[PDB]
């Protein structure tokens, strides 16, 4: 398949991007607490459903959320004020909470079977998103830095697995600050450092000139 790109709903962090994210690629967006990783996570669920000409490719997605922070209301609102359908947004988007790090990497594999349904439909899965990545992972493996980066490695190959193999745009948040950091180290195709600037600014910087937008009724935008 060609790359895909999916908007972000920002001109700014777009063209920081080569138009988007990019289909058969994790991206990995890292920042500290309230930086707008999640923000960024709800816009891409709206802006993958637009058409082509809009910045999308007509896509369903598919979310795991550790951290209990997806919010259908802001779905609903930034739908709203993307020109689309509320509800017709709400429902291309499959949602599971993960309980732990090992029922995080069985919801990847029960992902596989849904894409696969969706496959050759109007609407196929074209955006995974896993928010938070590391959240389970880094309470689970506190003073067990060597197993935690064995499970950690092989749920990042399988997300890089379903990313190339079904031409979806994984995208993954990851909270770091204070003291923190492995990032997820190369694992991502691409990492993306977000931080707050002045007066409520957002700041994006490639990892391995910088985006600046802001998070507004219509997810972000410049
Ligand atoms: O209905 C489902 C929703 C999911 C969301 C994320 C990951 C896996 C999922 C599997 C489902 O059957």
């Given at each position: 398949?060609?790359?895909?790109?999916?908007?972000?709903g920002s001109?700014?962090?777009?063209?920081?991007?080569?138009?988007?994210?990019?289909?058969?690629?994790?991206?990995?967006?890292?920042?500290?607490?309230?930086?707008?990783?999640?923000q960024?996570?709800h816009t891409?669920?709206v802006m993958?459903?637009?058409?082509?000409?809009?910045?999308?490719?007509?896509?369903?997605?598919?979310?795991?959320?550790?951290?209990?922070?997806?919010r259908?209301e802001r779905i609903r609102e930034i739908a709203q004020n993307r020109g689309l359908?509320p509800?017709?947004?709400?429902?291309?988007?499959?949602?599971?909470?993960?309980?732990?790090?090992?029922?995080?990497?069985?919801?990847?594999?029960?992902?596989?079977?849904?894409?696969?349904?969706?496959?050759?439909?109007?609407?196929?899965?074209?955006?995974?998103?896993?928010?938070?990545?590391?959240?389970?992972?880094?309470?689970?493996?506190?003073?067990?830095?060597?197993?935690?980066?064995?499970?950690?490695?092989?749920?990042?190959?399988?997300?890089?697995?379903?990313?190339?193999?079904?031409?979806?745009?994984?995208?993954?948040?990851?909270?770091?600050?204070?003291?923190?950091?492995?990032?997820?180290?190369?694992?991502?195709?691409?990492?993306?450092?977000?931080?707050?600037?002045?007066?409520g600014?957002?700041?994006?910087?490639?990892?391995?000139?910088?985006?600046?937008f802001s998070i507004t009724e219509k997810g972000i935008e410049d």
């Amino acid at each position: 398949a060609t790359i895909g790109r999916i908007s972000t709903g920002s001109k700014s962090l777009d063209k920081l991007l080569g138009g988007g994210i990019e289909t058969q690629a994790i991206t990995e967006v890292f920042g500290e607490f309230g930086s707008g990783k999640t923000q960024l996570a709800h816009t891409l669920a709206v802006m993958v459903q637009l058409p082509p000409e809009e910045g999308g490719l007509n896509g369903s997605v598919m979310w795991i959320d550790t951290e209990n922070t997806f919010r259908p209301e802001r779905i609903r609102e930034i739908a709203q004020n993307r020109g689309l359908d509320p509800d017709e947004v709400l429902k291309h988007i499959a949602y599971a909470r993960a309980f732990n790090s090992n029922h995080q990497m069985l919801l990847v594999q029960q992902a596989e079977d849904m894409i696969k349904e969706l496959l050759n439909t109007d609407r196929p899965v074209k955006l995974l998103i896993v928010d938070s990545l590391t959240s389970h992972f880094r309470s689970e493996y506190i003073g067990a830095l060597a197993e935690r980066q064995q499970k950690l490695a092989k749920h990042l190959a399988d997300l890089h697995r379903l990313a190339n193999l079904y031409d979806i745009a994984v995208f993954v948040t990851n909270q770091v600050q204070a003291n923190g950091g492995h990032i997820l180290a190369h694992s991502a195709t691409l990492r993306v450092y977000l931080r707050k600037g002045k007066g409520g600014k957002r700041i994006a910087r490639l990892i391995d000139g910088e985006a600046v937008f802001s998070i507004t009724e219509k997810g972000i935008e410049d």
